[PDB]
Design a binder for this molecule. Structure first.
Ligand code: HEC
Ligand code: HEC
Ligand SMILES: O=S([O-])[O-]
Length: 227
């Protein structure tokens, strides 16, 4: 593997590419507001792909975009064939954002690609970046949603809400995003999978493996949009 490095925003190039990258960052950070025709819920890409200092997709073990462009095209079992990064992003819009895929030459899609390529600068094509993806967490027992509920009330509720509906900021963006219900990810999303949610929760928080497993279980007992 190669190390995860975040390029310096002050070294962004003048011109069309620099401008595109800046637009791309905003599409990823503010998706429902910027692309209402394509987003069906309250989630922005950054809600599962966080980054510090205004960037998106720069956190190890929270599916960073650093180095993602050199890993496509790649096989998808879902599609039964090779897919491009453009297509992967489309699946995210359809599942995680409960919406509609952007046309494969849509300027907003190309701006997102430009941003991801910027984050990937210096990464050799084919190389795997340390911290890529969301590492699954699987336990050898059923998740205990009763324990999970207690854990949720103690550790999660103050941000994500008694009803999982999250907390809106002053401008109507989710400060704390919804975990279930009609504004959350739909059943087709990767986050709807127990081991992926447990893994995400484990790495993005102070929780033991058993606690992340049980609280993920509790979260995923709830309704959400059907895909
Ligand atoms: C949580 C509900 C998510 C939201 C909202 C978005 N994404 Fe996502 N993404 C998510 C998971 C759990 C994964 C799998 C991680 C893994 O281990 O493979 C992904 C993956 C991607 C990828 C592929 C990453 C890789 O191959 O390394 C891309 C390019 C991606 N996601 C893009 C993306 C965009 C652009 C989003 C806003 C439209 C977006 N995702 C939202 C979980 C979630
Ligand atoms: C405020 C201090 C929070 C507490 C406590 C918890 N979460 Fe959270 N979560 C929070 C934010 C701001 C975000 C967006 C990503 C980011 O880090 O910037 C999240 C994201 C999630 C997600 C993915 C997004 C979604 O489904 O909407 C999940 C699945 C999630 N959080 C679960 C979760 C659980 C189970 C918690 C208790 C262990 C928990 N979070 C605490 C803010 C906060
Ligand atoms: O592509 S994910 O949202 O399943």
């Amino acid at each position: 593997t190669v190390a995860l490095t975040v390029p310096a925003a002050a070294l962004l190039p003048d011109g069309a590419l620099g401008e595109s990258i800046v637009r791309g960052r905003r599409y990823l950070s503010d998706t429902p507001a910027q692309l209402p025709d394509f987003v069906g819920n309250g989630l922005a890409c950054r809600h599962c792909h966080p980054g510090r200092d205004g960037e998106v997709g720069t956190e190890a073990n929270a599916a960073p975009f650093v180095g993602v462009v050199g890993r496509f095209p790649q096989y998808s079992a879902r599609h039964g064939r090779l897919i491009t990064l453009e297509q992967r992003i489309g699946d995210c819009f359809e599942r995680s954002l409960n919406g509609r895929a952007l046309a494969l030459d849509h300027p907003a899609l190309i701006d997102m690609l430009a941003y991801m390529s910027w984050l990937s600068q210096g990464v050799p094509v084919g190389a795997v970046v340390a911290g890529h993806g969301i590492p699954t967490l699987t336990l050898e027992r059923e998740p205990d949603g009763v324990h999970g509920e207690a854990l949720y009330q103690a550790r999660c509720l103050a941000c994500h809400g008694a009803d999982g509906s999250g907390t809106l900021d002053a401008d109507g963006r989710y400060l704390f995003p919804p975990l279930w219900g009609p504004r959350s990810f739909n059943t087709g999303a990767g986050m709807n999978r127990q081991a992926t949610a447990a893994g995400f929760i484990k790495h993005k928080m102070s929780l033991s493996d058993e606690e992340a497993w049980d609280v993920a279980g509790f979260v995923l007992t709830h309704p959400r949009p059907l895909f």
